[PDB]
């Protein structure tokens, strides 16, 4: 053919059927799935639908607060950066023999959010008891509509897939107690959450409210001056997020001591090093709060490193990694015709107008 | 002039004077020193001797077992790779506001050993309480005579400079107790060292013996199968080194618990990744042994990364780095005349013999 840049890999147009994705034992062929998705390939709508629904079924049976044993690899934001997710697994260990805990924000901003969702759900189906996924603030309708995920589904698949994902996200657990010592959540604490039991009492199967316990777990952040506060206010309204709160060092310590916890592990905020450790607790000498962020070179501009936390007996190994190359996409998943047509039109019109003078 | 490859930098012929290297307060101008040594420039012999002798005076006052508090950047083997040492300080932080601890093996193999020594000694003179240097097994007469340091000193300076270095190496501390948690040594343990006090009793001011505690500190290695050993002997003779021992995982663990220590930090063995963390102790769940190796692309052939260990209470950061460009030197520091004359005298004589036969 007359394809100009031969060097560049052409995406397969063949869509994987149920037969090729699921073996006769009901288990998904994640390795085949990976290779296909990495080539920017698609699955038949019905197959993606099956992956999403079966994954939801499993998540739906889990508890608001997961009980996770060490060792485990804890990961922060992914935001549709599928190619960085592939490397994340090299760095953190194969899910075939590695326990995983994701803190949310799998979609939006990145242009491969559906692939991230399909691969992670496929992995969740295959490793029901060793790979865990928490809800992040972006795993909802309100944000995927404003950002890019809803549009991504409509262009690559259909709104039907988007709706199925929205229902799946509603099933996502809100937090996890890891090794009986760490409270893991996407955002943070809530003035309405004094004990782990307050988390169990919540009704998570729904769109996140604009305020309240569930909202705070998904949206709160530590104060900008966390640990060096000049305001004894434990919880102050988060004007940056437009909802929820900013929690202070004293607020965290109180919750930690009262609940016999060592630290709060969370994501939600980009970190140049892929992680950030905050002021140590006075009681244990261990970081009261740790932010983990897994999206290297976030938004293709920040050049930040990403990291994941491998926790073993009394040893926390933060592993950093850089970004990987990924395919190009026009804003809003626009095709070149829609993109260039308006310009072509006015330029041909302009040409004929000048000539007719 | 005749000079063919004009783009290549030419080393200065001027030898830095005493007033150029030392100022009124008796402090070394490390920045002028650095810049000059990087162009392969020399110092006046007397100035070299002054740096070496003054550094020695400082070293001579220190104890066999140094007490180094956190934070600190622990470095491994350098082996005369001066240009990588410049990179090392860039990655590990300025000596001006960073505490350092080098585990030895500053010379031999690399062709810029004297530069490494003069720079580190000058730094020791400038930062006596923040820059620490331990003795490695190469910091002695026996090895420097066999390898390259002696010949380097003779060609670039004089045997007097060599002798002064040998005197200074005898003053080098043998170990360090870092942050009251880690025992730091070049090589490792000794069957004759059951406590940290045993190290204090030793007389270090002499050429290292072919056997005994001092020898073991500088020469021992962990077993090849360390941690996964079916070998019941804690200490077995080191047939690879030709002296000292191979210590097992049990030996280390027994020694760590008995001295209430967290881990042994050493160098002595090249690592592809610049470092290595061995089997976790069953008493602390922390790596029982850690090897730090700071010479990148060792011997210009290994293609290995180098690394330094930046530490602060309970936070260990392993920073890696790749090699840097460095000037070329013929083996044994030969000049082109000594290198080719034998060939010339042979080829000419070879021509005439055939011409006359």
């Amino acid at each position: 053919t007359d394809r100009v840049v031969k060097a560049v890999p052409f995406p397969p147009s063949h869509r994987l059927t149920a037969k090729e994705v699921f073996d006769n034992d009901g288990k998904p062929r994640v390795d085949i799935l990976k290779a296909h998705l990495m080539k920017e390939g698609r699955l038949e709508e019905s197959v993606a639908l099956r992956i999403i629904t079966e994954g939801a079924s499993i998540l739906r049976q889990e508890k608001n607060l997961l009980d996770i044993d060490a060792p485990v690899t804890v990961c922060g934001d992914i935001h549709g950066q599928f190619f960085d997710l592939m490397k994340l697994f090299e760095v953190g260990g194969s899910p075939a023999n590695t326990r995983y805990l994701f803190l949310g924000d799998y979609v939006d901003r990145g242009y491969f959010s559906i692939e991230c969702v399909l691969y992670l759900w496929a992995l969740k189906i295959l490793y029901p008891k060793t790979l865990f996924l928490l809800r992040g603030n972006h795993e909802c309708r309100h944000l995927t509509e404003y950002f890019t995920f809803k549009q991504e589904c409509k262009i690559k698949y259909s709104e039907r897939v988007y709706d199925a994902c929205m229902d799946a996200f509603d099933c996502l657990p809100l937090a996890a107690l890891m090794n009986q010592q760490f409270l893991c959540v996407h955002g943070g604490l809530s003035p309405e959450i004094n004990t782990l039991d307050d988390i169990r009492k919540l009704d998570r199967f729904k769109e996140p409210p604009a305020y309240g316990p569930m909202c705070d777990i998904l949206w709160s952040d530590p104060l900008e001056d966390f640990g060096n506060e000049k305001t004894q206010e434990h919880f102050t309204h988060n004007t940056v997020r437009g909802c929820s709160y900013f929690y202070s060092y004293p607020a965290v310590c109180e919750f930690l001591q009262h609940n016999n916890l060592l630290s709060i592990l969370r994501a939600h905020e980009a970190q140049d090093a892929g992680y950030r450790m905050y002021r140590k607790s006075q009681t244990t000498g261990f970081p009261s709060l740790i932010t983990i962020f897994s999206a290297p070179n976030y938004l293709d501009v920040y050049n930040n490193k990403a990291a994941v936390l491998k926790y073993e007996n009394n040893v926390m190994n933060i592993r950093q990694f850089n970004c990987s190359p990924h395919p190009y996409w026009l804003p809003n998943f626009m095709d070149v015709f829609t993109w260039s047509l308006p310009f072509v039109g006015e330029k041909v019109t302009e040409m004929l107008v000048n000539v007719l003078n | 002039t005749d000079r063919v490859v004009k783009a290549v930098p030419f080393p200065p012929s001027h030898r830095l004077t005493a007033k150029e290297v030392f100022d009124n307060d008796g402090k070394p101008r490390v920045d002028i020193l650095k810049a000059h040594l990087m162009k392969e420039g020399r110092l006046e012999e007397s100035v070299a001797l002054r740096i070496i002798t003054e550094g020695a005076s400082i070293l001579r006052q220190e104890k066999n077992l140094l007490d180094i508090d956190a934070p600190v950047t622990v470095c491994g083997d350098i082996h005369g790779q001066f240009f990588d040492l410049m990179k090392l300080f860039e990655v590990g932080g300025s000596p001006a506001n960073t505490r350092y601890l080098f585990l030895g093996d500053y010379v031999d193999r690399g062709y810029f050993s004297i530069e490494c020594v003069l720079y580190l000694w000058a730094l020791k003179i400038l930062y006596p309480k923040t820059l620490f240097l331990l003795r490695g097994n190469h910091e002695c007469r026996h090895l420097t005579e066999y390898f390259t340091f002696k010949q380097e000193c003779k060609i670039k300076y004089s045997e007097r400079v060599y002798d002064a270095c040998m005197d200074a190496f005898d003053c080098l501390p043998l170990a360090a107790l870092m942050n009251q948690q880690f025992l730091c040594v070049h090589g490792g343990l000794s069957p004759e060292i059951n406590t940290l006090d045993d190290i204090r009793k030793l007389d270090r001011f002499k050429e290292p013996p072919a056997y005994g505690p001092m020898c073991d500190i500088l020469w021992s290695d962990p077993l090849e199968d360390f941690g996964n050993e079916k070998t019941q002997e804690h200490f077995t003779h080191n047939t690879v080194r030709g002296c000292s021992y191979f210590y097992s995982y049990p030996a280390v663990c027994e020694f760590l618990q008995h001295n209430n220590l967290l881990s042994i930090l050493r160098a002595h063995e090249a690592q592809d990744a610049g470092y290595r963390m061995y089997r976790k102790s069953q008493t602390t769940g922390f790596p029982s042994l850690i090897t730090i190796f700071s010479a990148p692309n060792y011997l210009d052939v290994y293609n290995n990364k180098a690394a330094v260990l930046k530490y602060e209470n309970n936070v260990m950061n392993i920073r890696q780095f790749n090699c840097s460009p460095h000037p070329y030197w013929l083996p044994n520091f030969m000049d082109v005349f000594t290198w080719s004359l034998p060939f010339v005298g042979e080829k000419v004589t070879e021509m005439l013999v055939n011409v006359l036969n």
């Binding site: 450790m277 000498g285 990291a307 926390m316 592993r319 | 963390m277 936070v315």
Partner: peptide
């Protein structure tokens, strides 16, 4: 009694 933190990388592979 509490875990120690070891930071490594960027793990290129």
């Amino acid at each position: 009694p509490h875990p120690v933190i070891v930071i490594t990388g960027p793990h290129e592979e």
